[PDB]
Design a protein around this nucleic acid. Structure first.
Ligand SMILES: [Zn+2]
Ligand SMILES: [Zn+2]
Lengths: 298, 230, 64, 248, 209, 82, 99
RNA sequence: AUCGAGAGGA
């Protein structure tokens, strides 16, 4: 659930949606290529000399440290703009993840193609340590293929790693609408944006800047128990069982659900309706043997 | 699930699988060999030594670079083995008993590749071209599946199934019973030839084996050896 | 696969162990009873049984 | 697909049924009215949270939850100042008493203030404003029964003094006991165990609705109080009830 | 970036003041409701510039019932706090004669520091919180009912009223998020007040284990 | 436990009624004296129900409490709800 | 839910050449930091923001024995390798690849 | 009589 104007303006709800949903570089990359591009002054890719020269015709980094192997990634406009993501941020994330060991340069947004250029920067001392130039693993092109495989899937640009998808909608049903008491004292239902997720990360989401921390909740009871504790999971377990039982319009008297949820929670931890719960109580061995594990219990 | 056209042996199953720089490597689960073999080693053991000659069995149009990129990790993996004798040794090191001499390991590998791998394609010598083409077709089918160009097979589709009727069901029993009868005829006669004298075969043939094997299995419906009823 | 082998010289069963020195692309098989040792080049495909087979082959090659 | 589901669903559901019974089979209402397991640990201090059996309760509506502040005041605040409305609702000696006796007027005002406080408590318990609740004694049907047993003419003024309503409902609340004892723990737990029923009782059986809407006579109200007491006591859970096996 | 860190520090401070107030330490209304721009005014807007330093954020509060019962809140600068930093806080607590402190850590705490919190526990009670678990006050969440720590006298009255042993009460783990919030130790009891759809209100009691 | 403050409910439970009627019927079938006038009714369980409604059954119910104490209540002390 | 490419503005701080910059960066310029409105000679259009930016430019302008076996462990390619070949990294990668 | 298997009922 969202606070403030982000609960009414769809664009702000979408902004929070982008702040939650996990986006890796693969979700925003159209293609990748590896080139032998040994002189940035005369790039073997023709379509980009006009910007590449502008980076090298200034002193901030030294072509003598440049590895001749180029990693070239092409992004696509729709996935970038659906996320309000910029190549300045992508480069910042790259340099945050790899430091100064990896050099990245990128083009103007005026282009019909979004491109950034990556290569290993060899700021070593030029020792004659020439036995394969490294003591065992790889040459630079195979290494750069490994760097690509890593960057595509293990570099996070936005969101929370476990939140695989987010949906936003207006709730048609009053059980998800915000209810207020008016100054006249009537109940009123407000239709406000909510986000539903695939995947769970309750503690991170509660701490987001416009998330309503009072109402936001998981359906995973072990997450509730970890973040909010035993009385929270006592209330959530009742809610979830009620939802399952009442989905078809059936009704069960509250005291039965209450007694099951209390049985599941009176020991201070989530006790499963399974041998791993029931047969770990202080109940005597003859009671345990009537359920499961009969001979091992005895 | 390969079966020879005449049921001289039961079916033998070959699996060619694609494993879940990192790349998609293809391996073969051959029968009587303890470990999965890189397919390119299986092709070299069948005597196709150069990478081009191998890919000519797997990729029928070379102007299709998406398949080439997908076989390439397997050409990389096997590049350390480059001669047929090294490949047959590699295969024979596995499955064969560790101590046997090089000639016996090579011979074991050739025996598996002739008689146990794809027996429906042939069990003769000089069948290696037929076997290389069918194993190449198996890899090609796997590539088409991995590229999404051909749909995965349905185990429910009744074209992929067969109904064993009374005849085949009885033939399954009678093979094993006739084998047990020949076994007992050898066991009976050997303790006469060990005693230097000819034997009456009318006494060697214990006709109870067939008569009671078929009777028992039809009586109980346990379709197998009575000793193995569970 | 089996990773312990009968020594070709001293006939003790499960007396030979293989050390796969991957970093130097070399494999050493050593018998604990007689301390006969053999070294062979190994690949990443190579396994203890390939080293043992190389040793048995080198022994039969020396008998010629 | 329906034949498959009919054959396949049954093992999983029956296993769930077994595991539930085996988890709860010894959970019982004790003679102290706590709910405890075989190791005698407290699971609930009162069954449900209210001490009542499930078979003796029914759906009712909380009349004070949903109304606006103006409609709440209009329906529930007794107007002791409009002489003609009293004259149409109460007999003459009652109108004379209600118009003049400042003590009675103060009792009626703090009756309304107790309803206002109860309304604010309900607004916290039911923040989604669903008035539908499950409670033991069906007050409206008992009032309709009193109306028919005593031949109440709705079109005549009643002999029932509104102060007898205020006092009678105060005295009835003291007889509907779920937690016994004079100590402040018992007294608080008693107040909690019966809070929602007492809110429903006070709002249904208030002096203004008894005057304007239900028009009960004194003998019919005296009958209604005894009916409510008897039906509440019959709703309390019996010690020895195997409530765990029942819940499973 | 500094606009994010200053917001985090402000939220964490607000939660810590709420926690201290709920534990019964004397906390002013002004610091309990301090706004983000007032935090920026008092402490600064560029913690990367060292303005504030997280050493500036330190809190000291005294109990409402005894002005000599005092508690620190420490916000270590290093992300993963080791035994050297615990020893520094132990020294400061020894010289100021303060027995309770909360240590709020950014990424975690070393095994040696964790054990050092156990091994001094009778004389100096040190508690660990991650900053992440202080970015929201969990007691404001709608699933969490009101928790009230009981006095020893009230527990004696409870056990005498219902004629029961402590081991017959339902339990709460000392590591429960709300038990950690209130700082309750083994053998304390927490009263829980929750609304009920059938009684109206229900109170339950949990023994800390 | 002191008898001057019994705290269990003054109503007879459904389980108490069931077992009291069974026990008393078995006593009447074993020729225990009957505490009521009989309109010629001969069924031990009907006689037991007459004695129950008359409040004449000579049986004490010992209600055990969870703490191991008990209260003794006579069947004539309890309110019979059926 | 909408999208557009409004990038009509330019980074207009000076190059080392003294020519003004012409790069259409959105919000951060690698050579110049956070973008701000600037005049026809690249001076910020803010008497205070041009002071904070000048102080940030000042902060940027202000900022025997045998072969030790650790000396091979600090090279850039080993630093990248320890990340990219980490067992957890390769597992998280192949976990995303299998999905 | 036991054990196992198979076919059925709700
Ligand atoms: Zn040896
Ligand atoms: Zn610029």
């Amino acid at each position: 659930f969202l606070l403030g104007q982000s609960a009414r303006d769809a664009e702000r709800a979408k902004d929070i949606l982008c702040r939650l949903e996990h986006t890796t570089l693969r979700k925003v990359t159209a293609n990748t290529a590896i080139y032998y591009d040994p002189n940035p002054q005369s790039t073997v890719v023709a379509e980009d000399q006009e910007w590449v020269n502008v980076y090298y015709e200034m002193p901030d980094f030294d072509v003598a440290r440049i590895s001749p192997w180029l990693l070239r990634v092409e992004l696509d406009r729709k996935h970038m703009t659906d996320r309000k993501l910029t190549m300045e941020q992508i480069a910042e994330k790259i340099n945050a993840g790899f430091g100064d060991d990896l050099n990245c340069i990128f083009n103007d947004d005026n282009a019909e193609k979004l491109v950034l250029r990556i290569r290993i920067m060899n700021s070593d001392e030029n020792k004659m340590q020439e036995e394969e130039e490294v003591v065992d693993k790889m040459d630079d092109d195979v290494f750069l293929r490994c760097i690509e495989s890593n960057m595509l899937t293990d570099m996070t640009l936005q969101g929370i790693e476990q939140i695989s998808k987010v949906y936003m909608h207006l709730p048609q049903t009053d059980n998800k609408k915000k209810i207020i008491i008016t100054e006249d004292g009537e109940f009123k239902a407000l239709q406000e944006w909510i986000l539903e997720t695939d995947g769970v990360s309750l503690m991170r989401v509660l701490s987001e800047k416009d998330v309503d921390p009072v109402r936001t909740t998981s359906n995973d009871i072990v997450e509730i128990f970890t973040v909010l504790g035993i009385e929270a999971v006592r209330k959530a377990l009742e809610r979830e069982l009620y939802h399952v039982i009442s989905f078809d319009g059936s009704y069960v008297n509250y005291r039965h659900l209450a007694l099951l949820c209390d049985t599941m929670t009176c020991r201070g931890h989530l006790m499963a309706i399974t041998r791993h719960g029931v047969n770990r109580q202080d109940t005597g061995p003859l009671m345990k043997c009537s359920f499961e594990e009969t001979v091992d219990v005895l | 699930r390969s079966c020879l056209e005449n049921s001289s042996r039961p079916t033998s199953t070959i699996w060619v699988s694609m494993l879940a720089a990192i790349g998609q490597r293809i391996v073969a689960t051959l029968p009587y060999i303890k470990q999965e073999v890189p397919i390119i080693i299986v092709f070299r053991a069948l005597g196709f030594v150069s990478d081009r000659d191998i890919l000519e069995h797997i990729i029928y149009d070379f102007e299709d670079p998406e398949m080439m990129e997908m076989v390439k990790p397997s050409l990389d993996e096997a590049f350390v083995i480059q001669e047929q004798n090294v490949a047959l040794n590699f295969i024979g090191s596995r499955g064969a008993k560790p101590g046997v001499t090089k000639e016996k390991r090579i011979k074991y590998a050739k025996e598996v590749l002739q008689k146990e791998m794809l027996p429906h394609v042939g069990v003769s010598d000089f069948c290696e071209t037929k076997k290389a083409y069918f194993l190449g077709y198996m890899v090609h089918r796997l590539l088409l599946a991995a590229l999404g160009r051909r749909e995965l097979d349905d185990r429910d589709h009744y074209g992929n199934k067969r109904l064993d009727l009374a005849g085949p069901l009885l033939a399954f029993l009678f093979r094993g019973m006739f084998k047990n009868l020949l076994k007992e005829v050898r066991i009976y006669a050997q303790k006469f030839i060990d005693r230097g004298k000819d034997f009456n075969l009318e006494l060697a043939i214990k006709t109870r084996i067939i008569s009671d094997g078929l009777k028992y299995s039809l009586a109980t419906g346990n379709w197998g050896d009575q000793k193995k009823a569970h | 696969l089996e990773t312990q082998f009968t020594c070709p010289f001293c006939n003790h069963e499960k007396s030979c162990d293989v050390k796969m020195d991957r970093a130097r692309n070399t494999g050493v098989i050593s018998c604990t009873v007689c301390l006969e040792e053999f070294q062979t080049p190994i690949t990443y495909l190579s396994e203890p049984v390939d080293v043992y087979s190389d040793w048995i082959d080198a022994c039969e090659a020396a008998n010629q | 697909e329906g034949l498959i589901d009919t054959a396949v669903k049954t093992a999983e559901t029956g296993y769930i049924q077994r595991r539930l019974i085996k988890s709860m089979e010894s959970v019982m209402v004790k003679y102290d009215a706590t709910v405890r397991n075989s190791i005698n640990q407290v699971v609930q201090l009162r069954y449900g949270e209210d001490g009542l059996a499930g078979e003796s309760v029914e759906f009712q509506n909380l009349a004070t939850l949903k109304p606006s502040n103006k409609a709440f005041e209009k329906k529930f605040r007794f107007d002791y100042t409009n002489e003609r409305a009293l004259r149409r609702t109460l007999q003459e000696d009652l109108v004379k008493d209600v118009l003049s006796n400042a003590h009675i007027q103060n009792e009626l005002e703090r009756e309304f203030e107790r309803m206002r406080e109860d309304r604010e408590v309900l607004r916290v318990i039911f923040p989604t404003g669903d008035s539908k609740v499950v409670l033991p004694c069906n007050l409206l049907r008992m009032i309709w029964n009193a109306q028919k047993i005593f031949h109440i003419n709705p079109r005549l003024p009643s002999d029932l003094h509104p102060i007898k309503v205020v006092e009678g409902v105060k005295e009835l609340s003291k007889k509907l006991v779920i937690v016994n004892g004079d100590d402040p723990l018992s007294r608080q737990a008693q107040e909690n165990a019966t809070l929602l029923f007492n809110i429903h009782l006070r709002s249904t059986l208030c002096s203004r609705r008894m005057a304007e809407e239900f028009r009960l006579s004194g003998e019919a109200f005296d009958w209604l109080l005894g009916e409510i007491e008897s039906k509440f006591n019959q709703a309390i859970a019996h010690p020895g009830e195997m409530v765990g096996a029942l819940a499973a | 970036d500094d606009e994010e860190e200053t917001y985090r520090l402000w939220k964490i401070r607000k939660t810590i003041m709420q926690l201290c107030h709920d534990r019964g330490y004397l906390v002013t209304q002004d610091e309990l409701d301090q706004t983000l721009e007032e935090f920026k005014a008092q402490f600064g807007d560029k913690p990367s510039e060292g303005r504030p330093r997280r050493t500036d954020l330190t809190v000291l509060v005294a109990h409402n019932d005894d002005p000599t019962d005092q508690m620190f809140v420490f916000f270590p600068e290093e992300p993963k706090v080791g035994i050297k930093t615990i020893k520094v806080y132990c020294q400061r607590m020894q010289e100021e004669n303060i027995t309770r402190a909360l240590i709020v850590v950014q990424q975690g705490m070393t095994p040696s520091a964790k054990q050092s919190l156990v091994d001094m526990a009778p004389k100096y009670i040190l508690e660990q919180f991650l900053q992440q678990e202080l970015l929201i006050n969990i007691t404001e969440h709608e699933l969490v009912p009101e928790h009230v720590v009981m006095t020893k006298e009230e527990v004696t009255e409870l056990l005498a009223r219902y004629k029961l042993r402590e081991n017959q009460l339902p339990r709460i783990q000392a590591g429960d998020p709300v038990a950690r919030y209130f700082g309750i130790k083994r053998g304390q009891v927490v009263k829980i007040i929750r609304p009920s759809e059938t009684a109206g209100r229900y109170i339950t009691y949990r023994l800390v284990q | 436990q002191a008898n001057q403050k019994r705290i269990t409910t003054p109503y007879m439970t459904k389980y108490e009624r069931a077992r009291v009627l069974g026990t008393r019927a078995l006593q009447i079938a074993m020729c225990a004296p009957v505490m009521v006038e009989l309109e010629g009714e001969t069924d031990p369980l009907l006689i037991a129900m007459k004695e129950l409604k008359a409040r004449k059954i000579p049986i004490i119910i010992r209600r055990y409490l969870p703490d191991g104490s008990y209260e003794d209540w006579g069947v004539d002390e309890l309110i019979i709800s059926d | 839910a909408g999208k557009f490419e409004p990038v009509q503005h330019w980074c207009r701080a000076p190059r080392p050449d003294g020519r003004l910059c012409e790069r259409q960066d959105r919000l951060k310029c690698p050579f110049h930091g956070k973008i701000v409105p600037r005049d026809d000679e690249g001076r910020p259009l803010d008497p205070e923001d041009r002071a904070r930016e000048q102080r940030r430019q000042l902060q940027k302008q202000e900022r025997p024995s045998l072969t030790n076996l650790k000396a091979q462990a600090d090279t850039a390619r080993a630093r990248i390798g320890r990340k990219v070949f980490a067992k957890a990294a390769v597992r998280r990668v192949v976990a995303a690849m299998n999905r």
